[PDB]
Every structure is written in structure tokens, then in C-alpha cells.
Design an enzyme around this catalytic site. Structure first.
Site, PDB file in Angstrom:
ATOM      1  N   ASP A  25       0.839  -1.198   0.000  1.00 53.06           N
ATOM      2  CA  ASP A  25       0.000   0.000   0.000  1.00 53.06           C
ATOM      3  C   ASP A  25       0.876   1.251   0.000  1.00 53.06           C
ATOM      4  O   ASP A  25       1.344   1.696   1.055  1.00 53.06           O
ATOM      5  CB  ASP A  25      -0.941  -0.015   1.200  1.00 53.06           C
ATOM      6  CG  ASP A  25      -1.976   1.083   1.136  1.00 53.06           C
ATOM      7  OD1 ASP A  25      -1.868   1.948   0.241  1.00 53.06           O
ATOM      8  OD2 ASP A  25      -2.906   1.073   1.966  1.00 53.06           O
ATOM      9  N   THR A  26       1.073   1.832  -1.187  1.00 53.13           N
ATOM     10  CA  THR A  26       1.831   3.071  -1.309  1.00 53.13           C
ATOM     11  C   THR A  26       1.125   4.256  -0.657  1.00 53.13           C
ATOM     12  O   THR A  26       1.769   5.280  -0.401  1.00 53.13           O
ATOM     13  CB  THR A  26       2.098   3.376  -2.783  1.00 53.13           C
ATOM     14  OG1 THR A  26       0.854   3.496  -3.494  1.00 53.13           O
ATOM     15  CG2 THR A  26       2.928   2.268  -3.401  1.00 53.13           C
ATOM     16  N   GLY A  27      -0.172   4.147  -0.387  1.00 56.08           N
ATOM     17  CA  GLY A  27      -0.904   5.187   0.303  1.00 56.08           C
ATOM     18  C   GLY A  27      -0.825   5.136   1.811  1.00 56.08           C
ATOM     19  O   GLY A  27      -1.343   6.033   2.480  1.00 56.08           O
TER      20      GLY A  27
HETATM   21  C1  LIG Z   1     -15.035  -0.311   7.421  1.00 61.01           C
HETATM   22  C2  LIG Z   1     -14.932  -0.517   5.896  1.00 61.01           C
HETATM   23  O1  LIG Z   1     -14.581  -1.851   5.626  1.00 61.01           O
HETATM   24  P1  LIG Z   1     -13.593  -2.192   4.335  1.00 61.01           P
HETATM   25  O2  LIG Z   1     -13.164  -3.588   4.448  1.00 61.01           O
HETATM   26  C3  LIG Z   1     -12.055  -1.108   4.407  1.00 61.01           C
HETATM   27  O3  LIG Z   1     -10.998  -1.836   3.827  1.00 61.01           O
HETATM   28  C4  LIG Z   1      -9.803  -1.088   3.595  1.00 61.01           C
HETATM   29  C5  LIG Z   1      -9.373   0.015   4.568  1.00 61.01           C
HETATM   30  C6  LIG Z   1      -8.072   0.807   4.303  1.00 61.01           C
HETATM   31  C7  LIG Z   1      -7.218   0.490   3.069  1.00 61.01           C
HETATM   32  C8  LIG Z   1      -5.918   1.300   2.805  1.00 61.01           C
HETATM   33  C9  LIG Z   1      -6.321   2.723   2.369  1.00 61.01           C
HETATM   34  N1  LIG Z   1      -7.215   2.585   1.249  1.00 61.01           N
HETATM   35  C10 LIG Z   1      -8.547   3.199   1.206  1.00 61.01           C
HETATM   36  O4  LIG Z   1      -8.979   3.885   2.082  1.00 61.01           O
HETATM   37  O5  LIG Z   1      -9.297   2.916   0.018  1.00 61.01           O
HETATM   38  C11 LIG Z   1     -10.685   3.242  -0.018  1.00 61.01           C
HETATM   39  C12 LIG Z   1     -10.923   3.939  -1.489  1.00 61.01           C
HETATM   40  O6  LIG Z   1     -10.812   2.903  -2.337  1.00 61.01           O
HETATM   41  C13 LIG Z   1     -11.435   1.691  -1.562  1.00 61.01           C
HETATM   42  O7  LIG Z   1     -10.707   0.672  -1.650  1.00 61.01           O
HETATM   43  C14 LIG Z   1     -10.191   0.258  -0.150  1.00 61.01           C
HETATM   44  C15 LIG Z   1     -10.870   0.975   0.716  1.00 61.01           C
HETATM   45  C16 LIG Z   1     -11.443   2.145  -0.043  1.00 61.01           C
HETATM   46  C17 LIG Z   1      -5.104   3.529   1.887  1.00 61.01           C
HETATM   47  O8  LIG Z   1      -4.410   2.804   0.942  1.00 61.01           O
HETATM   48  C18 LIG Z   1      -4.164   3.852   3.068  1.00 61.01           C
HETATM   49  N2  LIG Z   1      -4.880   4.766   4.016  1.00 61.01           N
HETATM   50  C19 LIG Z   1      -4.488   6.194   4.065  1.00 61.01           C
HETATM   51  C20 LIG Z   1      -4.956   6.923   2.784  1.00 61.01           C
HETATM   52  C21 LIG Z   1      -6.469   7.031   2.780  1.00 61.01           C
HETATM   53  C22 LIG Z   1      -4.328   8.313   2.733  1.00 61.01           C
HETATM   54  C23 LIG Z   1      -4.630   9.109   4.010  1.00 61.01           C
HETATM   55  S1  LIG Z   1      -5.256   4.085   5.563  1.00 61.01           S
HETATM   56  O9  LIG Z   1      -5.591   2.663   5.503  1.00 61.01           O
HETATM   57  O10 LIG Z   1      -6.430   4.714   6.154  1.00 61.01           O
HETATM   58  C24 LIG Z   1      -3.744   4.381   6.562  1.00 61.01           C
HETATM   59  C25 LIG Z   1      -3.625   5.695   7.334  1.00 61.01           C
HETATM   60  C26 LIG Z   1      -2.371   5.968   8.164  1.00 61.01           C
HETATM   61  C27 LIG Z   1      -1.251   4.919   8.209  1.00 61.01           C
HETATM   62  O11 LIG Z   1      -0.075   5.134   8.971  1.00 61.01           O
HETATM   63  C28 LIG Z   1       0.005   6.304   9.753  1.00 61.01           C
HETATM   64  C29 LIG Z   1      -1.382   3.605   7.426  1.00 61.01           C
HETATM   65  C30 LIG Z   1      -2.637   3.331   6.592  1.00 61.01           C
HETATM   66  C31 LIG Z   1      -7.650  -0.613   2.096  1.00 61.01           C
HETATM   67  C32 LIG Z   1      -8.948  -1.405   2.362  1.00 61.01           C
HETATM   68  O12 LIG Z   1     -14.416  -1.987   2.915  1.00 61.01           O
HETATM   69  C33 LIG Z   1     -13.826  -1.381   1.801  1.00 61.01           C
HETATM   70  C34 LIG Z   1     -12.887  -2.351   1.080  1.00 61.01           C
END
Ligand SMILES: CCOP(=O)(COc1ccc(C[C@H](NC(=O)O[C@H]2CO[C@H]3OCC[C@H]32)[C@H](O)CN(C[C@@H](C)CC)S(=O)(=O)c2ccc(OC)cc2)cc1)OCC
Lengths: 99, 99
Positions: A25-27
Site C-alpha cells: 500500500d503506497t498510500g
Molecule cells: C469499514 C470498511 O470496511 P472495508 O473492508 C475497508 O478496507 C480497507 C481500509 C483501508 C485500506 C488502505 C487505504 N485505502 C482506502 O482507504 O481505500 C478506499 C478507497 O478505495 C477503496 O478501496 C479500499 C478501501 C477504499 C489507503 O491505501 C491507506 N490509508 C491512508 C490513505 C487514505 C491516505 C490518508 S489508511 O488505511 O487509512 C492508513 C492511514 C495511516 C497509516 O499510517 C500512519 C497507514 C494506513 C484498504 C482497504 O471496505 C472497503 C474495502
């Protein structure tokens, strides 16, 4: 290797003597893993993303192996919906984005 | 180009004729941008992140140029902490992970 992004970039990791699946996860600034009872001390921390913040336990100097590439750094443990390998470890395995 | 991960992979994007900064996010299935004005119809949708779900506006078949590379796809607009370019558009510009 090269990983396309048609599907989620899921790989096997080795941590604490256990194998798990995690997202490259590059994000993610940091690495967040599903609940697991790692040994040693830790400190509470809050991390935020889409939807708000969650509570996690910060473990330091943890060894993880990602696709046979070893890395050592901080790992956050908590009720995360998915295991994400963040930039703190991706840098160590020489991971880049390319287009 | 080849982008390392020692810093956040932030790039400039052009959407609706406006320039913005966004995060190349291999952990995001979809592309989510902060609140902004876009023309055309939109449908309400829900997406879940690390901390829960948010309400977004779904814009389909939107033109968006990412670091000089054109894409046309779905863009979600809502209270995300940062503009994230997800895999739905990263694939269009030919982006891969490499290590
Ligand atoms: C309760 C819901 O249930 P879910 O299972 C949730 O699952 C997921 C939850 C999180 C992710 C990863 C995050 N991706 C994400 O938000 O993507 C959204 C949009 O596209 C969809 O695809 C997947 C989800 C939707 C992202 O890559 C990384 N993030 C920061 C980003 C936002 C920049 C600030 S961060 O994780 O928050 C994070 C913060 C601080 C850190 O270190 C200090 C380390 C990590 C992937 C799947 O349902 C949906 C699948």
C-alpha cells in the site's frame, strides 16, 4: 518482480513466526496489521484514514519478510479491516511505482 | 517515471480543468478526491476506509490527467483526508509496483 494493479496487490508476509496476507500500500505511511499478540512492549497510537481514526498498538523494530525480502521497522496492530504494508517497509524492499 | 517511496507519492493531477495534488495509492480500489465542484450528473455512494464509511458523490467517465498521463474513469468526491488515486485509474496509466 512486477505487480500489476488489476487486482489488489496481495502478498504473503512472515511476521512473528507467522504467515499472513497483506496489501502493498503506497498510500499507507505506516504498516497496519490485524490483531496479533506480538511479544514485547508497545505504545498506544491512533491512525486516521477514510472514515476516521482507530486505536492501534505500536511495536518497534519488528522483522517482516515480504516476498522473501526482509525488512525491520514499526508495525501497528489493531482492529484494522485489512493488513497493509506501508511505505516504512516498502522502501526497505526496494519497492517503486512505475509508469 | 519511477517513483520511490521515501516520501508520499504525491503527484499533480488535472480534473475539471483544475490542478490538484493527489496520492498514488495502491491500497485504494477507487479514486477519492476532496470536496470539489464537478459538472455532470452524480449518484450518491458509500465507501469504507480504515475508520468506517463516508458518503461520496460518484462521477463516472470523468477525464483526469495524472502526472501527464490521461485517464477516463470513476471519481468519488467526498470528505476524504487526502486526494487518493486508486487502482481504477492507476491501471489506466500503466502503473505497476516493482521491487
Ligand atoms: C469499514 C470498511 O470496511 P472495508 O473492508 C475497508 O478496507 C480497507 C481500509 C483501508 C485500506 C488502505 C487505504 N485505502 C482506502 O482507504 O481505500 C478506499 C478507497 O478505495 C477503496 O478501496 C479500499 C478501501 C477504499 C489507503 O491505501 C491507506 N490509508 C491512508 C490513505 C487514505 C491516505 C490518508 S489508511 O488505511 O487509512 C492508513 C492511514 C495511516 C497509516 O499510517 C500512519 C497507514 C494506513 C484498504 C482497504 O471496505 C472497503 C474495502
Amino acid at each position: 518482480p512486477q505487480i500489476t494493479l488489476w487486482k489488489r496487490p496481495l502478498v504473503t508476509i512472515k511476521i512473528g513466526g507467522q504467515l499472513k496476507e497483506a496489501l502493498l500500500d503506497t498510500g499507507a505511511d505506516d504498516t497496519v496489521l490485524e490483531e496479533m499478540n506480538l511479544p514485547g512492549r508497545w505504545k498506544p497510537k491512533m491512525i486516521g484514514g477514510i472514515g476516521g481514526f482507530i486505536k492501534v498498538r505500536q511495536y518497534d523494530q519488528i522483522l517482516i519478510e515480504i516476498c522473501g525480502h526482509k525488512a525491520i521497522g514499526t508495525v501497528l496492530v489493531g482492529p484494522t479491516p485489512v493488513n497493509v504494508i506501508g511505505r516504512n517497509l516498502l522502501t526497505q524492499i526496494g519497492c517503486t511505482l512505475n509508469f
